[PDB]
Structures are given as structure tokens and as C-alpha cells.
Write an enzyme that holds these catalytic residues in place. Structure first.
Site, short mmCIF file in Angstrom:
data_model
loop_
_atom_site.label_atom_id
_atom_site.label_comp_id
_atom_site.label_asym_id
_atom_site.label_seq_id
_atom_site.Cartn_x
_atom_site.Cartn_y
_atom_site.Cartn_z
N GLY A 1 -5.22 3.32 -3.35
CA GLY A 1 -6.51 3.91 -3.68
C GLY A 1 -6.33 5.35 -4.11
N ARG B 1 -17.78 24.54 -4.38
CA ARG B 1 -17.36 23.78 -5.56
C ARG B 1 -17.18 24.65 -6.80
NH1 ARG B 1 -20.42 20.75 -7.76
NH2 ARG B 1 -19.08 18.95 -8.26
N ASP C 1 -7.19 -2.42 2.83
CA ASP C 1 -6.07 -3.32 2.61
C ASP C 1 -6.40 -4.74 3.06
OD1 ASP C 1 -4.26 -1.41 1.51
OD2 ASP C 1 -3.86 -0.65 3.53
N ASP D 1 15.91 -38.25 18.28
CA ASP D 1 16.12 -37.48 17.06
C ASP D 1 15.44 -36.12 17.14
OD1 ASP D 1 17.43 -39.75 16.18
OD2 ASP D 1 15.71 -40.47 15.02
N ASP E 1 -2.17 -0.68 6.00
CA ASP E 1 -2.53 -0.19 7.32
C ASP E 1 -4.01 0.20 7.40
OD1 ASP E 1 -2.12 1.98 5.58
OD2 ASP E 1 -1.81 3.35 7.27
N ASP F 1 0.84 -1.18 0.00
CA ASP F 1 0.00 0.00 0.00
C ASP F 1 0.89 1.24 0.00
OD1 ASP F 1 -2.08 1.79 0.16
OD2 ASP F 1 -2.28 1.60 2.34
#
Ligand SMILES: C/C=C(\C)C(=O)O[C@H]1C(C)=C2[C@H]([C@@H]1OC(=O)CCCCCCC)[C@@](C)(OC(C)=O)C[C@H](OC(=O)CCC)[C@@]1(O)[C@H]2OC(=O)[C@@]1(C)O
Ligand code: ALF
Ligand SMILES: [Mg+2]
EC number: 7.2.2.10
Length: 994
Positions: free
Chosen positions: A626, A489, A707, A800, A703, A351
Site C-alpha cells: 500500500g 500544510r 493483507d 497397509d 501482517d 507485503d
């Protein structure tokens, strides 16, 4: 309603048939709830205390051992009274270990946290809806919300469901979609349709997603989907079920056990076609029940000699020790079998944000205006050091530390960054680090102001708490923030109305400070600031400004650029409408350009070198983020995933571009490309799957919540120490150091451990090979029971079991990280090595049975039974007029069995020295290098004497304390096993490859 993002708000309301003002009728709520169910994420708890135990008795190497355990209990009942001193010893131990090892596999599997339970922490308890039940907004359970519901969300609220936004009440709706994108940056939403039906989450700017939280604002919307039909539900769905497969070494063990199940049955049948020429004459000595005792007692003793029991204890021992080592290395391991795997890693999917980068926005470049003379325009460009929010860095003018107070342009620039800012800086005294308060892109400005210090304020004497907002405080003491026109906007910017400190309420010395996108702001700038002076905005000037913006916003830099400007003559406060945001752009006209700041989420200081170490170790690293493809590729070049001038047209795809590719080319792109950006959580796990289709062990490190689907699907899930709880629960390992360099060190440990693991696997297997050859002889050659399965359970586990673990401390090679990753399908025993352990197996098997015959043929303290009259071990009590000898108990004497077992032990101690290395002589490879191996053999031989001394020990094993007479013969039979393997080693490194 899927693809509601592609439909209008009217079409979405029509889909469910519901008024925006009234909401769902109680009948509609009834019918929708029965159709779409409750808005819930179904919890999962497959791991119980019972089912884990059932899982233990499912393994092939266990069921066979369990089958032999059942038989052993049956064949122990049929016993006389002359030797009833050892009644039920074999069925007890064979079941004791089967429980002793099965109780370990549960203790290291039920202790796991539930990633889904951690995921459901992002599910709000309640939610606000508008029903037809009443006009007032109802605060109901978030689970009682159905698709079609009219939902209201406010600032601070956690989004209850996937919602198509109907209307935004505030000026803007700022949403934190970190659980789906891994980016905590506020996303500005709208209520317009998103035509693309294949659009990803980052494209759906008219959608609200469950689990995400409203950073700022208030809006209304209609529920698109609920439950697992949501994006967070997709994350949930990809984290259920058998999520993780088997270790590549365990696949080799299962491959061994598979063939073992077929050859054991083959040997038992083999010893049937040879025992025919003897049924021509009957013998009233034993019927079917007495004649089948020797056919099933060897059938269960063969499995014991074959199955390397004690190995799961040795492996668990070796794995637990490595975990303690890596924990000191700062790697915390949650899954023991993953340690082994980590070594065989060839690809590491990483990531970007929080993993490769510091997740802290930092202004790294900024420029003001130097000189404006006609068609000429120069700029004072600066660079800033520091990758965190801490006020610790230097302003660099051409790689030279120069104070910012000397530049008047930087003074007003820092002023805007401090005033035009709704966020602040804070020092967490508990964590001892500086943290952000509000927007990360705004705190970056706060940190910048502190770094700059344009007033030369003495701040070296101040504490870390005061240092956080010291320089920012001083700027507030000059201009008082009256009101702020928030962001919109249409304007793509923000401003603050400030007034000089301590003045009359009728003066004219007010200022405005605009901050926003370069395109919009500069276009509204009719002037240019040079230090303190002002010049008009012209062609060549504007071109020079925008050019550097494009050079900084793209290429090797690719930074988020912010145009900073001031309005020296702001409108009267009385003639400004503050309740209407549509007029704010008009208020931000006739501006004066001051400068531009460039910010980025910088990579960690030790990432570039860490990736290089992986490349030297033959491990490629693929970025799957992302975040946008611009910053993604830019970071890849910084950390060395890409070249600074390398073409990556076909080596970098977005999730959208990746989906357009045919399934064949998608799979190929994973082998080609090393960077994937703007992806959904499902994309990361899909890329991992594609890589796993090329028989590649792949590691995933992240993290965030997004993910987790890839953290689970990957062989090795790696989480960050400061990461989310969801990421840690879905990971096999956690980096407490939060450094990528820790991974490289962990891989080195993983490789070193496996090489040692690869050794005692061979050692214990070869031990079990020789044991089977031994049993094969006594069943075919005609000799009596040389070794009983009771003894073998103590040899493969204790005798063994100790040198095996001692081989886990073998000195690793110095070129352990200069060698390419091993193949996952690499057999542990093949080629000349297979011929070695076959010759050794035939040697050990002959050294035990042969030593047993030494007590009968070439003896001195025993009877002189020749080879001919030894085959008829049974016909001694039933047959005397034809066979006259001495006693009949000689065949079941506690001396030839002890003679064979003593040989077996001695050889393994010598074979362990041949197991320290594969193709190197003991002369060139000193056996005294492994100190833990020497102390293991001495400890093993000490227990070999203990079992022959303390009377309650050789009783159940049917052993007699061999004197110093027969012990000298051991050093003439068991000892020269060194030379046999030594010759094979010499030939292998001279006629094959050194
Ligand atoms: C340990 C006990 C031995 C006797 C055994 O049965 O294992 C066999 C068998 C299953 C294989 C063999 C064993 O074959 C024999 O040694 C012949 C046995 C029949 C003769 C009877 C004696 C007179 C392994 C043990 O022998 C070598 C030592 O020569 C090596 C290897 O195993 C590995 O690489 C271990 C993987 C964890 C496997 O060929 C393996 O099968 C394949 O699938 C592998 C890839 O597994
Ligand atoms: F933090 Al990310 F994809 F970069 F989840
Ligand atoms: Mg992250």
C-alpha cells in the site's frame, strides 16, 4: 454517498439535505436508518457443530462407502444358524471407520478463529454526533449512526464510519490508516474535493475511514457510507463464504474418486453380460431373493477393495508430524492441508511493510556542509548502520566508523533532531526491545541522536532503559523548549522555540529549530552553516544541496529527506501570535541551513538471501504494498526482486495504473510485473486471483488488516508473529520468527513431505488395485469368495496403514530445492508407472485367487478339486447324482480365504519396498535406509500372527492359523513380486529416461 470524495463539502451536505450546524432531524434519522440500515459489520458463524458433520457425509468416496455400509447391514440379517458365530461384524466396522474418520475432519476444521470477529475489534462502541435533537454533542452507539449524520472525532478516537470531512478544528488532522494501507504513518487530511472518481484510499485525503484512528487533532464531518458500504466493509465482504478451495492433492483424490464411482459401477455391470449362458435351465435351488445374494455381496465388497480407507488417517498422521517439525522451525501451521500445498508453490505474493521490512524508520544517510568556496561546494555525507529503533549503530564516513562529536555540523543537526521532536524512544522491558512513542518518522530522529552521541557521553555502562533517551536528555539540558509551532500544510515544516539553560528573563540568546520538506525549508534559508560559522546561501551552494536531495529522494536510494535548519535570531516572544498557525511560516523565515537527514523503512537482513533461495527453487516473489511506488521499487532492488540497473517501466504498476489496464493486460501484468504499490486491500486479492487463473498455487505473506483479503484468497496465507490478529486469523501459517527465511525452509519441508506423500498414495492405491482384480476374478472365473470385505478393512487400515505412514519418513533428495516447482495438474499415476501398477494389480489379484485355487487344485493337505469342478461352487448341496465329491462346506472353508489373505499381506510388505523409490533398484537403493519402514513391516507381520493366534481374532475374520507348510509356498508366489517390478524399473530407466 459513494464518490463523496469527488464532491465538495457543500455538495455532500446537499446530497443528504442537512445543516452542518444543526444536523439530522429526528425524522431524517428515522428515514435514513430505515434506508441505509445500522452502521454495523454483520458477524458470520457458518461453522457449527452440526453442519460440519453433514459436510463429512458429502464426499464422493464416503457416500459410496456409506451406501455399501447400508447394504452390508441388510445382507447381514439374512443368515442361517450354522455359522451365526459371526452375526453382525461387517456392518459394524464399515460404519465404525466412517465415523472414526468423520469425527477427525471436524476436530481439524471447527477450531479456527473468526477473522471477521477480529476485524470487528476496529469497530468503536460509541460515537459523537450532532443531531437536531439538541445543541450539545450526543454520545450515541456507533451502530445508530446513519449516512448524512454530522460526526465529530477527536484524538484517540476510533473512526465510526466512512466520513467526508467537513471542517478540521485543529491545525491539522493526523490519521492512522494502517488497516487499509499497512502504513502507520500519520496522514494529513483536508476538506478539499478529490476530482478523480477512480481515486484509491491513499488519494482520498478528504475522507475518514471506519476502523482507522485519529492520531492527532479534532475535526467535523458528514457520514458518506455505513455498514458494509465502507472500505472496512469491503475487507469484511471479501472474507466470507467458501473463501478457500481444495488442495491440489485432494483434487487428485476427488478425480480418482470420480472415475472410481464410474468404474465400480462398470465392473458390477461387466459381471452381468458374462453370466447369461446358464439361464436356459432352471433350478429349484433359489429364487430371486436367493439368487441376488451373490450379486450384492460382491457389489459392496468391490467398493471396499477399491476405496483406499485408512488413507485419511495416514495423511492426517503425516501432516500432524510435519506440523511439529515446522513448529520447531518456527512456522506455526493453522491448516494441515496447506502444508501439502505449500510445496507446490510457484509464486509468493509478499507485503512490504512489516513483512519484508522492519517497519521501523531509520536514518541511513545524512549530510552537512563541508566547504563553501565561491562556486564550489562540498558536503560531508554520512551513512548510519542499524535497521531498528535501538541505539545500536555506527556513524560511517566513507565506510569508516567516526565519532559525530568531531563534526560541529552534526552537533547542531542532532540538536534539532532532539529538540524539534514531539516523539520519544522507549524500551519495553517486557519484550526486551526498544519501541517508539509517537510518530515513527520522529522516533527515527530520537534513535539517530542516541547513535550519534555528539558529546561522547559514556553510555556503555548505562542500562538499556537509560540508553533509550540518554543522549537526548543531555541535549535538553542545553536548550529549554519554550513553545513549539506545530506543523501546517501550507508551510510543510515544524519548529521549536528554545532558550539556553539557566539564564535571565531579559537576555537575547534564544534559538529556533526548523524541520520539514527540503523544498520549502531551504527556500526559506538565507544562510548556510559550516560547522559553527555561517555563510550566505548562494546559487552553486543551493544547487549542490538540492542535487543530493534529488539523488537521495530518488533512484536506488529513494529516501524521505528532511531539511534541518535553525533561526539564529528568532523574533521576540511578545510579538508572536501562537494561536494563529497561518503566521508560523513567517516566523520560519531567514533560516540557516544545517543539514539533511534521509530515512527509510529498511528491509530485514535475511530477506535478500531468502528471495534468492526462492528463485533457485523456481519461485518468483511479487511485492504488493500500500506504500508508494517509489519506495516499493527501491526496496525490490535492495532485496533482489529487481536488478540495480534493471528497467521496470512495464514491471511495476500502481493500483491506479493497474485498473486502467484492460482486463486482458491486467492478467498478463501479474505474470510479468513483480511489484505493485499504492494498492487497496481488494487489489492484493485481485492480483492473487489473476495468478490463480494461470493454474498457479500462490502464497500470500503479510501482517496487516489490508493483507487479510489476499491472505484468504491465496492458497497459502502466511502471517507474521508480530503481525495483526486479523492477519493471523486469515492465514494458514504464522511465522513466529518473523523471518522471511522461515518461509523458504517451510517450502522445503512442504516439498519433502509431498514426495513422501506421493509415495504411499501410490502404494495404497496400487494395493487397492490388486484387490479389485482379485474380486473381479472370483466373480468371473467362478471361484468362491477368496476374500471378504471384512478382511480388507483391516488390511488397508492396519496392514497397509502402517507402512504407508512409514513411507512418510523416506529420505528426501539433496536437490529438493534445486528443482523447479511441480505442476499442480500433475497426475500421480501415468505413463510407464500406470503400466506397472496395472501389471502388479493383475499380479496381486491373481496371487490371491490363484493361491485360493492352490488349496483346491495344486494342493497337498486339501481336496484335489480340479479347475472344472470348482466353477460350480453353488451346485454342491443341490446337485449330487451328477456331481459326486466329498463335502460341501469346503467352498466356505477358513483355509483358502486365509491362504489368499496371507499372500496379500506378504506382497504389500514387499511392494512397500518397491514403493520406497519410483525408478531405482533395491540394490542401489537400500531398503534398510528407511529404518521406520523396517520396523513397520515387522510390526505389520506381528499383527498378522496375532490375528491368527488369539482365538477371538480369527473368529470374526474366519481365519485358520496356517502352519509352516503352506507358508513356504507364500515365499514362492508373493516373494517374486520384487523381480516383476524390478524388471519394469530397469526398462523404465534404460529405454525411457534414467
Ligand atoms: C484403486 C482401485 C482401482 C482398481 C481403480 O478402480 O481405480 C482406477 C481409476 C479410478 C484410476 C486408475 C484405476 O484404473 C485401473 O487400475 C483399472 C481398473 C478397472 C479394472 C478392474 C480390475 C480387474 C489408477 C488408480 O490406477 C493405476 C494404479 O493404474 C491411477 C490414477 O490414479 C491416481 O493417479 C491417483 C490420484 C490420487 C487414475 O488414472 C484413476 O483415474 C484417474 O482419474 C486417475 C488419474 O486418478
Ligand atoms: F504493510 Al503493507 F501493503 F506494505 F499492508
Ligand atoms: Mg505490513
Amino acid at each position: 454517498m459513494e464518490a463523496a470524495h469527488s464532491k465538495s463539502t457543500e455538495e455532500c451536505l446537499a446530497y443528504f439535505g442537512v445543516s452542518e450546524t444543526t444536523g439530522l432531524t429526528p425524522d431524517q434519522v428515522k428515514r435514513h436508518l430505515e434506508k441505509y440500515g445500522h452502521n454495523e459489520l454483520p458477524a458470520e458463524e457458518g461453522k457449527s457443530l452440526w453442519e460440519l458433520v453433514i459436510e463429512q457425509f458429502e464426499d464422493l468416496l464416503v457416500r459410496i462407502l456409506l451406501l455399501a455400509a447400508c447394504i452390508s447391514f441388510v445382507l447381514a440379517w439374512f443368515e442361517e444358524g450354522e455359522e451365526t458365530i459371526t452375526a453382525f461384524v461387517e456392518p459394524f466396522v464399515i460404519l465404525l471407520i466412517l465415523i472414526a474418520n468423520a469425527i477427525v475432519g471436524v476436530w481439524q476444521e471447527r477450531n479456527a478463529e473468526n477473522a471477521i470477529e477480529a476485524l470487528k475489534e476496529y469497530e468503536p462502541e460509541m460515537g459523537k454526533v450532532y443531531r437536531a435533537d439538541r445543541k450539545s454533542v450526543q454520545r450515541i452507539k456507533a451502530r445508530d449512526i446513519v449516512p448524512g449524520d454530522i460526526v465529530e472525532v477527536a484524538v484517540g478516537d476510533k473512526v465510526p464510519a466512512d466520513i467526508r470531512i467537513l471542517s478540521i478544528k485543529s491545525t491539522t488532522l493526523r490519521v492512522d490508516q494502517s488497516i487499509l494501507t499497512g502504513e502507520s504513518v500519520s496522514v494529513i487530511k483536508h476538506t478539499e474535493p478529490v476530482p478523480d472518481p477512480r481515486a484509491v484510499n491513499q488519494d482520498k485525503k478528504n475522507m475518514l475511514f471506519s476502523g482507522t484512528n485519529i492520531a492527532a487533532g479534532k475535526a467535523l464531518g458528514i457520514v458518506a457510507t455505513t455498514g458494509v458500504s465502507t472500505e472496512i466493509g469491503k475487507i469484511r465482504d471479501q472474507m466470507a463464504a467458501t473463501e478457500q478451495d481444495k488442495t491440489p492433492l485432494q483434487q487428485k483424490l476427488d478425480e480418482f474418486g470420480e472415475q472410481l464411482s464410474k468404474v465400480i459401477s462398470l465392473i458390477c455391470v461387466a459381471v452381468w453380460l458374462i453370466n447369461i449362458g446358464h439361464f436356459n435351465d432352471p433350478v429349484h435351488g433359489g429364487s430371486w431373493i436367493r439368487g441376488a445374494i451373490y450379486y450384492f455381496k460382491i457389489a459392496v465388497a468391490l467398493a471396499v477393495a477399491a476405496i483406499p480407507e485408512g488413507l485419511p488417517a495416514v495423511i492426517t498422521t503425516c501432516l500432524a508430524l510435519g506440523t511439529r517439525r515446522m513448529a520447531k522451525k518456527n512456522a506455526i501451521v493453522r491448516s494441515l492441508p496447506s502444508v501439502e500445498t505449500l510445496g507446490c508453490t510457484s509464486v509468493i505474493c509478499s507485503d512490504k511493510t512489516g513483512t519484508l521490512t522492519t517497519n521501523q524508520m531509520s536514518v541511513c544517510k545524512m549530510f552537512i556542509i563541508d566547504k563553501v568556496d565561491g562556486d564550489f561546494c562540498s558536503l560531508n555525507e554520512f551513512s548510519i548502520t542499524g535497521s531498528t529503533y535501538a541505539p545500536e549503530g555506527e556513524v560511517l564516513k566513507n565506510d569508516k566508523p567516526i565519532r559525530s562529536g568531531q563534526f560541529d555540523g552534526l552537533v547542531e543537526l542532532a540538536t534539532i533532531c532532539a529538540l524539534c521532536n514531539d516523539s520519544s524512544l522507549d524500551f519495553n522491558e517486557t519484550k526486551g526491545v526498544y519501541e517508539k512513542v509517537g510518530e515513527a518518522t520522529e522516533t527515527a530522529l530520537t534513535t539517530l541522536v542516541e547513535k550519534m552521541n555528539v558529546f561522547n557521553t559514556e553510555v556503555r555502562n548505562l542500562s538499556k532503559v537509560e540508553r533509550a533517551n540518554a543522549c537526548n536528555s543531555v541535549i535538553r539540558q542545553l536548550m529549554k523548549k519554550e513553545f513549539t509551532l506545530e506543523f501546517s500544510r501550507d508551510r510543510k515544516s515544524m519548529s521549536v522555540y528554545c532558550s539556553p539553560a539557566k539564564s535571565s528573563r531579559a537576555a537575547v540568546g534564544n534559538k529556533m529549530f526548523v524541520k520539514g520538506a527540503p523544498e520549502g525549508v531551504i527556500d526559506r534559508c538565507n544562510y548556510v552553516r559550516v560547522g559553527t560559522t555561517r555563510v550566505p546561501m548562494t546559487g552553486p551552494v543551493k544547487e549542490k544541496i538540492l542535487s543530493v536531495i534529488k539523488e537521495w529522494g530518488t533512484g536506488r536510494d529513494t529516501l524521505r529527506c528532511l531539511a534541518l535548519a535553525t533561526r539564529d535570531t528568532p523574533p521576540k516572544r511578545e510579538e508572536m501570535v501562537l494561536d494563529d498557525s497561518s503566521r508560523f511560516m513567517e516566523y520560519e523565515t531567514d533560516l540557516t541551513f544545517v543539514g539533511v537527514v534521509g530515512m527509510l523503512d529498511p528491509p530485514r537482513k535475511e530477506v535478500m538471501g531468502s528471495i534468492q533461495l526462492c528463485r533457485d527453487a523456481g519461485i518468483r516473489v511479487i511485492m504488493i504494498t500500500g506504500d508508494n511506488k517509489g519506495t516499493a521499487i527501491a526496496i525490490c532492488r535492495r532485496i533482489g526482486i529487481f536488478g540495480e540497473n534493471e528497467e521496470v517501466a512495464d514491471r511495476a504498476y500502481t493500483g491506479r495504473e493497474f485498473d486502467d489496464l484492460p482486463l486482458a493486460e491486467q492478467r498478463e501484468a501479474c505474470r510479468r510485473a513483480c511489484c505493485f504499490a499504492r494498492v487497496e486491500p481488494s487489489h492484493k486479492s485481485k492480483i492473487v486471483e489473476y495468478l490463480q487463473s494461470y493454474d498457479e498455487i500462490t502464497a500470500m505473506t503479510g501482517d496487516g488488516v489490508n493483507d487479510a483479503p489476499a491472505l484468504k484468497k491465496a492458497e497459502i496465507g502466511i502471517a507474521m508473529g508480530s503481525g495483526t490478529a486479523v492477519a493471523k486469523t486469515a492465514s494458514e501459517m504464522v511465522l513466529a520468527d518473523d523471518n522471511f527465511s522461515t518461509i523458504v525452509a517451510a517450502v522445503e519441508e512442504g516439498r519433502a513431505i509431498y514426495n513422501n506423500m506421493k509415495q504411499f498414495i501410490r502404494y495404497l492405491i496400487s494395493s487397492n488395485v490388486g484387490e479389485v482384480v482379485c474380486i473381479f476374478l472370483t466373480a468371473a472365473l467362478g471361484l468362491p469368495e477368496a476374500l471378504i470385505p471384512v478382511q480388507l478393512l483391516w488390511v488397508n487400515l492396519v496392514t497397509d496403514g502402517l507402512p504407508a505412514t512409514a513411507l512418510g519418513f523416506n529420505p528426501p533428495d539433496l536437490d529438493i530445492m534445486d528443482r523447479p516447482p511441480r505442476s499442480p495438474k500433475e497426475p500421480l499415476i501415468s505413463g510407464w508407472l500406470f503400466f506397472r501398477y496395472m501389471a502388479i494389480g493383475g499380479y496381486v489379484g491373481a496371487a490371491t485367487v490363484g493361491a485360493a485355487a492352490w488349496w483346491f487344485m495344486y494342493a497337498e493337505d486339501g481336496p484335489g478339486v480340479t479347475y472344472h469342478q470348482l466353477t460350480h461352487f453353488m451346485q454342491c448341496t443341490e446337485d449330487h447324482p451328477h456331481f459326486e465329491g466329498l463335502d460341501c462346506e469346503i467352498f466356505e472353508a477358513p483355509e483358502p480365504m486365509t491362504m489368499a489373505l496371507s499372500v496379500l499381506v506378504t506382497i504389500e510388505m514387499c511392494n512397500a519396498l518397491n514403493s520406497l523409490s519410483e525408478n531405482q533398484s533395491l540394490m542401489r537403493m537400500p531398503p534398510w535406509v528407511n529404518i521406520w519402514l523396517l520396523g513397520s513391516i515387522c510390526l505389520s507381520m506381528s499383527l498378522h500372527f496375532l490375528i491368527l493366534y488369539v482365538d477371538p481374532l480369527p473368529m470374526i475374520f474366519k481365519l485358520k492359523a496356517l502352519d509352516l507348510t503352506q507358508w513356504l509356498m507364500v515365499l514362492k508366489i508373493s516373494l517374486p513380486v520384487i523381480g516383476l517390478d524390478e524388471i519394469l524399473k530397469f526398462i523404465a530407466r534404460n529405454y525411457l529416461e534414467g
